[PDB]
């Protein structure tokens, strides 16, 4: 009856020659990586960027999510750490016991109990797509905006930074974004327009728990994902489908989709692949920044 945790998804650990360009990087993890949807990659353990954030001014309503809307067929204000106030509270209420005692397997378990549950009814914030242009990037960025010490000028050039990511893509003739989360709030299932890649840092906080099916089963994943979605939605256009599509894992690898999983923790990348479906939720209080590019 319980949640059982997928596979767990590739880890790379790259040296410092191998973390010397991302693209380059991910070219060479591809074979492997483009058979799991995603992957984590830890920097070495001296890459360390300072956040840039201008935590002062930010503020920002958070979108209110009910983890069981499907089976069961508002706007507050927050400062960064009014919203850590509220998320640590509801997660120690929650579970009676400290945050950071929480086992990651049992928010994990939980969470899913949730979004199936008819009889208990779960509501959380997630302060999602805010854009880094409102209150700047959490990487330092060269625009004069805010200042940078010398110690990290070399984090606002890095390859790495996601603000340096190659955007552009080509024919014939993008920002990030950033997450603030909470124990529970999530993403549904879904690929990026024109099968872009993503890349994902977690500056800091609680770890998020991913999920992901490579390439080759998407076409799998999306027959099952109708077949079992509400009649009322089946015929909805993809783009549209996906604002709903949450579905337990453990479903889709009962139907034969391949699935892995991880726990990013503050300091990691996930990168996910082209056309690799994935969701996933965060496991407490926490701050992602998030890119789409192609190669
Ligand atoms: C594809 N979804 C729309 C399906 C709906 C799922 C859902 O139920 N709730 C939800 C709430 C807020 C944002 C989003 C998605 O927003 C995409 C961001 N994009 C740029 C800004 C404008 C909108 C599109 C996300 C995609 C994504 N992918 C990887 C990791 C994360 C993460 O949260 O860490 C996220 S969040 C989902
Ligand atoms: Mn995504």
């Given at each position: 009856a319980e949640f059982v945790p997928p596979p767990e998804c590739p880890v790379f650990e790259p040296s410092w020659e191998e973390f010397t360009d991302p693209l380059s990087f991910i070219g060479r993890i591809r074979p492997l990586a483009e058979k799991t949807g995603i992957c984590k990659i830890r920097p070495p353990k001296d890459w360390q960027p300072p956040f840039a954030c201008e935590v002062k001014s930010f503020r920002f309503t958070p979108r209110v999510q009910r983890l069981n809307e499907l089976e069961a067929m508002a706007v507050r204000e927050y400062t960064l750490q009014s919203f850590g106030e509220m998320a640590d509270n509801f997660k120690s209420d929650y579970?009676?016991?400290?945050?950071?005692?929480?086992p990651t397997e049992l928010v994990e378990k939980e969470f899913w109990r949730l979004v199936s549950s008819i009889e208990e009814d779960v509501i959380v914030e997630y302060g999602a797509?805010?854009?880094?242009?409102?209150?700047?990037?959490g990487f330092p960025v060269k625009d004069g905006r805010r200042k940078i010490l010398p110690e990290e000028e070399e984090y606002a050039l890095?390859?790495?930074?996601?603000?340096?990511?190659?955007?552009l893509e080509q024919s014939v003739l993008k920002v990030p974004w950033l997450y603030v989360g909470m124990c529970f709030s999530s993403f549904c299932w879904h690929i990026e327009d024109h099968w872009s890649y993503s890349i994902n840092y977690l500056h800091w906080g609680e770890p998020k728990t991913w999920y992901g099916v490579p390439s080759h089963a998407a076409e799998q994943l999306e027959e099952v994902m109708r077949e079992l979605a509400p009649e009322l939605f089946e015929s909805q256009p993809d783009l549209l489908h996906?604002?709903?599509?949450?579905?337990n894992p453990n479903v889709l690898m009962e139907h034969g989709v391949p699935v892995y999983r991880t726990n990013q923790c503050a300091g990691e990348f996930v990168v996910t692949f082209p056309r690799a479906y994935h969701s996933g939720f965060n496991q407490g209080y926490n701050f992602a920044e998030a890119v789409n590019f192609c190669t």
């Open positions: 579970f009676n016991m400290p945050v950071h005692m929480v797509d805010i854009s880094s242009k409102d209150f700047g990037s890095s390859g790495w930074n996601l603000n340096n990511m190659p955007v996906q604002l709903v599509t949450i579905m």
